[PDB]
């Protein structure tokens, strides 16, 4: 039987294309890749162009034929038109800065208010204060993004990154803090900036010297799919051209290594850190900027033996530097180094918590050390004495979710942004005291037409295949019955010590309301939810544990009558695309709809493209014979089930035509192979393409809504759901 939506657009095959891999078990294994031509970028291949255009047109026709697509876009537009803001961030110009969106602006704007006048911002009258920077003015389409910013210590200068209009490359710009954007400036330019333009940057790590004369940054050779190579550290002096910038570090022997510098808050010490993979291990060196001219002739001293640990600067006290480090402490700890006694090594200030991952450490009110711990898949705030490390107790103990803390060592107050599945964003002020402090509600995000009291988030524990107890969040309307009829949207990642925290998404709650559905977040292995050991149990030869955890979550939801066996939708992005494609291959019968965002799918070829080589610490090295065998077992691109005795779920793949973070070739080849293997469906396999590269880290509000309307209408069609 031939479905009315077919046939699929044709995709050229290369029947001769193969690579031979060393294998511990088999000696050698020859892997055919009939779609290897789709590894050539869109801009360089007419074949890749023809594939993208035909697949894009085919997907759009199917998605747009569904009237629920426009119904979802209208519902999303109306509900997403709510005011959003960050916590107040104190800066060296004596102003608080905050992110603001009226509702449907493409990008967040940056506003400011004099410290002491903050009670006049974020009222019914509007954001108040003064507009500082409006990213919406940068591009005609609103796809140009602020990638970061750092104010000069003097408070006169503001260094900031803007993503270039084709790519995930950026330029660093500088403007005076006396040159804000004006509300009536025209789109397509950046008015009021200084002449400085730092090109060839792929990540924003900028550190000003204490004299405010310049900043350190990391850059690459000029850009005229290939692995990212030859990261260099430079120093830029304000008012000079980039051509005058002084080279601080290059390592031509190790072109895949990523390098950056961080300065202590005093600006006295510079920490050089190199990374050779995605693991939390560095090659680290410290220099005293008072001993050295900026250049390649600086007196670098070894902080510790290379590749054993990561070191993040938390503060300084003369020659004493405070570090958050995992040195002999996989869950991280706080330790001090005396730059005057390097050979004495690191002294523990806050011991590793064996049962809690330390996320951050920051100094406040001169000598209060604030620790954010991850315990039971949510944030805890602990206060410690900076001098002794002695515990001073807990704050916000009653709030279960995630926190963003803003405030400096010199401020007695912090602003804390609290959020969860059910809390869109409450900014609390906390004022430090002698024995206890005082907490005040500053401002709360409210969403018109959403009643947060209509929803709940349950915490359950389920056994995985191997008997391991896994935590899962289940968000649902309180009035949805547990009678085994509800649809599920189940989101997972599983990797890189990244926790799936309670996180606010209006879209997800609208999915729950409109489809009487549950939103399930199983805290599967690979994440840091139960400490670094939770990551170690879900990587390399144990990556299969991640898929088993996710499958067992679905089986538990069905068995305990949370969900209909026929209405499971799964969702994942990047490393989460390994999860969605692997689970679809290994248990196609569990799932009715699979959403993959910028998926990693070819687990043999991933090292050959942009930043993929760094993922070898997580997945293994496919060119190592031992690693090949365990990677090849699950590599979703190489394990599409034979068509004869499998019905594939409906599958929708989101990707840009250009993406540095995950090369779109992963999606291109897997979509080609799925369509070839299952040419008659019965369930469609579609690729939803953005041609504007709408950056992950810089996506306009309107693009996000269109993508969500495509995703939800496709899930609705695929699982036979009616919008309520
Ligand atoms: Na823009």
């Amino acid at each position: 039987s031939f479905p009315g939506w077919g046939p699929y657009p044709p995709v050229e095959r290369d029947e001769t294309s193969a690579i031979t891999y060393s294998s511990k078990l088999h000696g050698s294994v020859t892997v055919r890749d009939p779609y290897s031509q789709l590894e050539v970028p869109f801009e360089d291949s007419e074949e890749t162009k023809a594939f993208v255009h035909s697949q894009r047109k085919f997907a759009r026709t199917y998605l747009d034929e569904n009237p629920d697509r426009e119904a979802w876009l209208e519902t999303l537009k109306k509900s997403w038109n709510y005011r959003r803001f960050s916590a107040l961030k104190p800066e060296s110009d004596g102003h608080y800065y905050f992110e603001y969106n009226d509702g449907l602006q493409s990008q967040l704007s940056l506003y400011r208010v004099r410290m002491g006048e903050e009670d006049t911002v974020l009222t019914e009258s509007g954001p108040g204060g003064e507009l500082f920077f409006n990213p919406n003015l940068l591009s005609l389409d609103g796809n140009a993004a602020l990638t970061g910013f750092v104010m000069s210590p003097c408070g006169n200068y503001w260094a900031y990154g803007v993503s270039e209009h084709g790519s995930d490359w950026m330029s660093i710009y500088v403007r005076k803090t006396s040159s804000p954007h004006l509300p009536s400036q025209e789109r397509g330019k950046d008015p009021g900036r200084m002449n400085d333009k730092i090109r060839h940057v792929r990540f924003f790590i900028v550190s000003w010297t204490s004299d405010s004369k310049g900043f350190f940054y990391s850059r690459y050779p000029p850009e005229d799919n290939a692995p990212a190579m030859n990261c260099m550290v430079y120093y830029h002096r304000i008012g000079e051209d980039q051509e005058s910038d002084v080279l601080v570090h290059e390592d031509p022997e190790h072109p895949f290594w990523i390098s950056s510098v961080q300065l202590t808050p005093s600006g006295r010490y510079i920490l050089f850190a190199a990374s050779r993979d995605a693991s939390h291990t560095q090659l680290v060196k410290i220099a005293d900027l008072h001993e050295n001219d900026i250049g390649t002739n600086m007196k670098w001293k070894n902080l510790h033996d290379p590749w054993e640990a990561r070191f993040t600067i938390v503060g300084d006290e003369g020659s004493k530097i405070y570090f958050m480090t995992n040195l002999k402490a996989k869950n991280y700890k706080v330790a001090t180094f005396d730059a005057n006694h390097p050979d004495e090594g690191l002294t523990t200030l806050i011991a590793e918590d064996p049962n809690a991952f330390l996320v951050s450490a920051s100094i406040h009110a001169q000598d209060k050390l604030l620790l954010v711990y991850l315990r039971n898949a949510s944030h805890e705030i602990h206060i410690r004495d900076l001098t002794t490390g002695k515990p001073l107790g807990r704050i916000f103990e009653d709030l279960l979710g995630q926190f963003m803390v803003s405030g400096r060592r010199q401020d007695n107050d912090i602003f804390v942004l609290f959020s969860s599945f059910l809390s869109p964003g409450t900014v609390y002020r906390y004022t430090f005291g002698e024995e206890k402090g005082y907490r005040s509600l500053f401002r709360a995000i409210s969403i018109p037409g959403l009643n947060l009291d209509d929803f709940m988030t349950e915490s359950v524990f389920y056994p995985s295949k191997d008997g391991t107890s896994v935590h899962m969040f289940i968000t649902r309307p309180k009035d949805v019955l547990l009678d085994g009829t509800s649809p599920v949207l189940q989101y997972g990642y599983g990797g890189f010590s990244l926790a799936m925290l309670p996180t606010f998404s209006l879209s997800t709650l609208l999915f729950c309301k409109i489809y009487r559905a549950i939103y399930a977040i199983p805290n599967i292995r690979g994440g840091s939810e139960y400490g670094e050991s939770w990551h170690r149990e879900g990587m390399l030869d144990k990556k299969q544990n991640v898929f088993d955890d996710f499958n067992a979550a679905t089986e538990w939801l069905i068995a305990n009558k949370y969900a209909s066996k026929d209405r499971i939708a799964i969702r994942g992005g990047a490393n989460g695309g390994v999860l969605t494609t692997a689970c679809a291959n290994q248990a196609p019968g569990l799932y009715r709809c699979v959403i993959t965002i910028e998926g990693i799918i070819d687990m043999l070829r991933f090292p050959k493209f942009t930043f993929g080589a760094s993922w070898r610490s997580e997945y293994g090295d496919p060119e190592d014979p031992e690693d090949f065998d365990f990677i090849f077992k699950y590599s979703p691109y190489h394990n599409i089930p034979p068509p004869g005795d499998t019905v594939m779920p409906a599958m929708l793949f989101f990707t840009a035509a250009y993406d540095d973070r995950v090369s779109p070739l992963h999606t291109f080849k897997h979509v080609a192979a799925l369509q070839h293997n299952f040419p008659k469906g019965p369930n469609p396999c579609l690729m939803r393409i953005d041609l504007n590269s709408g950056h992950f880290a810089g996506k306009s509000t309107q693009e996000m809504l269109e993508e969500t309307a495509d995703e939800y209408s496709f899930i609705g069609k695929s699982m036979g759901l009616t919008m309520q």
Side-chain angles (χ1 to χ4, degrees):
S1 177
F2 185 48
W5 52 257
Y8 284 122
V11 184
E12 289 191 23
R13 288 171 62 84
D14 184 348
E15 303 292 351
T16 75
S17 184
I19 299 170
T20 302
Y21 290 91
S22 204
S23 159
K24 175 195 185 64
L25 183 51
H26 302 297
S28 281
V29 173
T30 292
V31 178
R32 310 211 72 80
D33 191 349
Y35 301 108
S36 61
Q37 305 310 129
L38 294 179
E39 291 188 353
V40 184
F42 175 82
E43 65 222 316
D44 296 333
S45 173
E46 292 299 292
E47 213 175 315
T48 305
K49 259 168 201 196
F51 173 80
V52 167
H53 289 318
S54 59
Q55 290 292 336
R56 174 181 55 86
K57 207 117 206 304
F58 183 76
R60 275 263 55 85
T61 299
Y62 185 95
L63 293 167
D64 290 331
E65 195 269 4
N66 186 354
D68 288 1
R69 198 269 175 179
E70 285 315 305
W72 263 113
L73 186 57
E74 274 217 36
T75 302
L76 289 163
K77 259 197 215 287
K78 288 213 147 206
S79 307
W80 267 91
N81 190 20
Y82 74 93
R83 297 163 221 126
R84 295 183 287 287
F85 49 79
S86 61
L88 298 187
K89 174 96 143 48
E91 300 289 351
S92 55
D93 69 343
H95 285 64
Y96 290 116
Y97 288 68
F98 61 96
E99 294 169 340
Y100 187 78
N101 195 321
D102 193 51
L104 297 184
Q105 297 173 276
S106 306
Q107 304 290 321
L108 288 164
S109 280
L110 206 63
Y111 285 77
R112 66 179 178 190
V113 59
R114 184 84 59 179
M115 294 174 81
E117 298 180 28
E118 63 275 6
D119 295 320
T120 65
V121 305
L122 299 171
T123 69
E124 53 295 340
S125 48
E130 193 189 24
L131 171 62
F132 182 66
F133 197 83
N134 182 3
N136 301 295
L137 299 181
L138 292 173
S139 61
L140 344 314
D141 50 355
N143 286 315
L146 231 199
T147 55
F149 50 88
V150 193
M151 192 172 288
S152 63
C154 69
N156 292 300
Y157 303 104
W158 197 72
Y160 60 103
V162 176
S163 74
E164 295 269 17
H165 192 255
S167 79
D168 290 327
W169 294 69
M170 58 192 267
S171 300
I172 313 267
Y173 300 95
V174 187
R175 71 189 307 109
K176 293 174 179 167
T177 55
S178 61
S179 291
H181 281 160
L182 300 180
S184 177
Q185 286 168 340
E186 198 149 38
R187 284 207 234 95
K189 64 202 74 228
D190 185 359
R193 73 176 179 79
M194 296 159 60
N195 294 329
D196 308 57
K197 189 179 178 174
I198 310 312
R199 290 184 291 157
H200 315 124
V201 173
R202 298 183 92 167
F203 54 85
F204 190 87
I205 287 87
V206 172
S207 298
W208 288 94
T209 44
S210 58
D211 57 12
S212 293
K213 288 214 313 291
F215 55 81
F216 295 93
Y217 68 96
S218 296
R219 59 155 292 185
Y220 285 82
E223 194 194 333
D224 293 314
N225 254 15
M229 287 184 299
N230 300 121
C231 184
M232 300 170 285
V233 180
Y234 275 82
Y235 185 73
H236 177 62
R237 285 174 238 266
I238 305 302
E240 297 192 353
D241 182 274
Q242 183 167 22
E243 291 303 318
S244 310
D245 288 7
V246 171
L247 177 62
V248 171
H249 181 94
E250 62 180 5
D251 188 6
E253 186 172 4
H254 307 106
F256 283 16
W257 291 14
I258 296 166
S259 66
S260 57
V261 292
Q262 186 178 53
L263 270 53
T264 60
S266 73
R268 179 167 178 195
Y269 298 102
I270 183 167
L271 173 68
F272 173 84
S275 183
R276 64 181 180 180
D277 60 28
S279 74
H280 291 189
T281 62
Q282 297 170 319
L283 185 151
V284 278
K285 297 180 313 186
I286 291 272
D288 183 338
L289 286 177
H290 300 160
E291 274 191 309
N292 299 289
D293 283 350
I294 305 308
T296 46
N297 291 341
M298 291 192 272
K299 297 176 219 290
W300 294 105
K301 180 79 202 101
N302 276 343
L303 179 49
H304 196 260
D305 294 319
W307 310 121
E308 277 180 42
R310 175 166 159 239
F311 303 82
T312 304
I313 299 166
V314 163
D316 60 37
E317 257 284 45
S319 71
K320 184 187 272 198
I321 308 176
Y322 297 89
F323 285 113
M324 196 183 128
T325 181
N326 59 353
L327 177 54
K328 295 208 148 59
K330 58 167 172 293
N331 284 345
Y332 282 83
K333 67 181 184 183
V334 182
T336 62
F337 171 80
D338 195 337
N340 287 340
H341 309 278
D343 305 347
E344 111 182 342
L346 286 283
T347 305
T348 299
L349 180 57
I350 309 305
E352 189 197 11
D353 189 335
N355 301 318
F357 194 74
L358 180 64
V359 175
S360 66
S362 47
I363 306 174
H364 308 274
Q366 289 303 332
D367 65 356
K368 297 283 180 297
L369 183 57
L370 185 154
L371 306 182
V372 179
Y373 283 105
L374 184 50
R375 203 196 298 261
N376 208 235
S378 59
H379 284 164
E380 293 179 353
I381 300 173
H382 296 231
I383 308 306
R384 303 301 201 100
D385 180 65
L386 184 64
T387 312
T388 66
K390 180 185 182 276
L392 299 181
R394 293 277 320 281
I395 60 170
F396 296 103
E397 34 254 79
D398 59 309
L399 297 183
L400 297 180
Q402 69 176 278
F403 301 115
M404 200 151 294
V405 180
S406 50
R408 309 164 298 173
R409 176 160 194 183
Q410 62 206 80
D411 309 306
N412 292 129
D413 287 2
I414 56 185
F415 290 85
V416 179
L417 180 65
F418 168 74
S419 67
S420 74
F421 296 112
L422 300 179
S423 196
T426 303
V427 178
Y428 294 88
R429 196 203 282 240
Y430 183 86
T431 303
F432 282 94
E434 184 61 16
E435 296 204 341
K436 53 189 154 56
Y438 79 75
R439 143 187 171 185
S440 168
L441 201 158
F442 179 59
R443 298 287 190 273
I445 298 175
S446 68
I447 307 189
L450 191 67
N451 176 11
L452 300 167
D453 188 49
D454 280 353
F455 300 94
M456 55 189 286
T457 297
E458 308 184 25
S459 270
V460 298
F461 296 83
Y462 71 92
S464 195
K465 181 177 172 188
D466 72 5
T468 305
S469 185
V470 180
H471 175 271
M472 176 161 47
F473 291 112
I474 307 169
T475 302
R476 64 188 181 81
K478 295 185 175 171
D479 68 331
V480 157
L481 289 183
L482 302 198
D483 62 358
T485 64
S486 43
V488 174
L489 184 55
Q490 182 182 317
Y491 181 57
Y493 183 81
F496 292 96
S497 299
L498 192 77
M500 297 294 97
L501 300 174
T503 308
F504 189 77
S505 172
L506 172 55
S507 292
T508 299
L509 296 187
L510 291 174
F511 186 96
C512 288
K513 183 199 195 277
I514 299 287
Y515 288 139
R516 311 273 303 146
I518 80 181
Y519 183 60
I521 302 282
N523 294 112
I524 66 192
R525 285 172 281 189
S528 53
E529 291 94 335
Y530 291 97
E532 180 53 21
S533 67
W534 200 240
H535 172 228
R536 293 190 183 172
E537 288 197 62
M539 67 193 288
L540 299 173
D541 61 316
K542 287 183 275 298
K543 187 62 174 181
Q544 184 56 47
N545 289 337
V546 176
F547 313 142
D548 292 346
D549 289 348
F550 201 63
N551 287 325
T554 304
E555 284 172 331
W556 187 95
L557 289 168
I558 296 166
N560 292 272
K561 295 173 273 155
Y562 279 82
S564 162
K565 180 219 211 208
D566 299 325
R567 294 160 163 219
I568 312 300
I570 55 167
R571 193 183 191 283
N575 168 72
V578 184
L579 175 68
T580 54
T581 62
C583 289
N585 286 345
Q586 293 180 352
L590 271 192
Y591 307 111
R592 193 78 178 283
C593 198
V594 182
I595 310 299
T596 302
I597 317 286
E598 301 162 34
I600 303 165
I601 313 173
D602 189 335
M603 307 310 293
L604 297 185
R605 296 286 292 158
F606 74 82
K608 302 297 182 193
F609 308 102
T610 63
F611 292 104
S614 73
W615 310 332
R616 285 175 303 177
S617 57
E618 193 70 5
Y619 303 133
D621 183 359
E623 287 183 6
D624 179 280
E626 190 133 19
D627 290 9
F628 176 84
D629 292 339
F630 69 62
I631 292 172
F632 194 53
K633 276 208 59 150
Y634 77 79
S635 179
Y637 183 51
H638 302 101
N639 288 282
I640 298 165
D645 51 357
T646 287
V647 177
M648 271 304 102
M651 300 186 84
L652 183 58
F653 293 85
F654 288 84
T655 188
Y658 335 83
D659 181 348
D660 286 2
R661 188 261 214 260
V662 181
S663 298
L665 61 94
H666 286 279
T667 298
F668 294 174
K669 295 196 304 179
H670 200 62
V671 168
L674 283 168
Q675 287 181 2
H676 176 78
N677 204 84
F678 301 103
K680 304 296 170 184
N683 308 313
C685 177
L686 298 182
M687 193 176 65
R688 196 285 189 189
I689 281 275
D690 184 27
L691 285 184
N692 299 311
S693 169
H695 310 125
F696 193 35
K699 189 110 68 189
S700 79
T701 301
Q702 181 173 28
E703 285 302 331
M704 177 204 203
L705 293 183
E706 281 170 343
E707 288 177 24
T708 306
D710 287 341
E711 177 183 331
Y712 289 181
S713 59
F714 184 80
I715 292 166
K717 188 83 189 304
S718 301
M719 308 212 305
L721 309 184
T722 308
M723 294 175 75
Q724 306 262 311

